[model samples]
Target: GSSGSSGEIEICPKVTQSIHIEKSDTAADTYGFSLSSVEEDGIRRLYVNSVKETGLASKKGLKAGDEILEINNRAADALNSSMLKDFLSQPSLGLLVRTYPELEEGVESGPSSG
Candidate 1:
């Protein structure tokens, strides 16, 4: 008589971050976000193009051009290769808290109060 064998497969864990975006006061049917890249002094800077302009931007009060400094209090600039790998390795679907620029008094600026 002959017998059949079976083997088990193992799954690994990953790390990731989630960003919650609300809508703004706009009638645009499209849903998502955009960003732009710029080179300054040989350093590349990323800028937000536009948000959904409906839920979080309008309801929760997130602006369109607000610079993303940190996610869940973790600074983006300080992220290393391993940290980034760990961050990207995690499973999706988690809470993301970000910080933006706060303009100085009397300076012409967009809505910064949140």
Candidate 2:
């Protein structure tokens, strides 16, 4: 279920000012990227609470509960505290991100390529 404060959707601040890589999902794929639940807590805080339900968990290499720690290599977590300031710091339309996949107690983070 989509949570709180809605009507018109807003972009996550970190992503709003930076490049966006849009993709589509299919039943066979079951996962792809979308902006359906992206959010920003403040100028310094951005998060992606659930991507699996959004169908972006596989396509973007993102998983549910994966905190967006970086964008285009710009640290999403330390955006405000570091020398790097905003999402535009790196500025690229295409991004190759390192995401922490959804995990169980004894699981490691990576694709289940088997």
Candidate 3:
């Protein structure tokens, strides 16, 4: 097996934070925002790759390289993307995605939100 990414990421939870994205029914063909999480390395690395004009995530300060470090306070790396989708595919409530920005350089690694 081979690793699925580049750059060295801290093995532990570093710059951890949460964003509660409420998913509304937006058909992708029309004005829509769809979040597709690709599963690899047996871990579901969710990315904010697409967001239509009216998408919720569009207004959020989520960087292009943002990834979920934890979901609902649990480490997201512990499960695959499918595992998260299975639980998050819901009829009520919203997804409070605890994420971390993966791109930071030349900073002294310490207690700081990256």
Tell me how candidate 2 scores on lDDT: 0.40
Query: Which is the leading candidate under TM-score?
Result: 3
Model 3, residue 103: distance off in Å is 20
Which portions of model 2 show Cα errors greater than 4 Å?
1-45, 52-54, 77-114
Which of the two candidates, 2 or 3, achieves a greater TM-score against the reference?
3
**Shift in Å, residue 5, candidate 3:** 18
Question: At residue 24, what lDDT does model 1 achieve?
Answer: 38
How well is each residue in 1-114 modelled by candidate 2, as lDDT tens digits?
146656445452222222244444232443233222243554353444455544434444554444444555654544443433322232222333432223345753458845
TM-scores of all candidate predictions against the true structure: 0.35, 0.28, 0.42
* Model number with the top lDDT: 3
What ranges in model 1 sit over 4 Å off? 1-31, 71-114
Task: Quantify all predictions' global Cα lDDT against the true fold.
Answer: 0.44, 0.40, 0.50
For model 2, give the RMSD to the true fold. Answer: 13.6
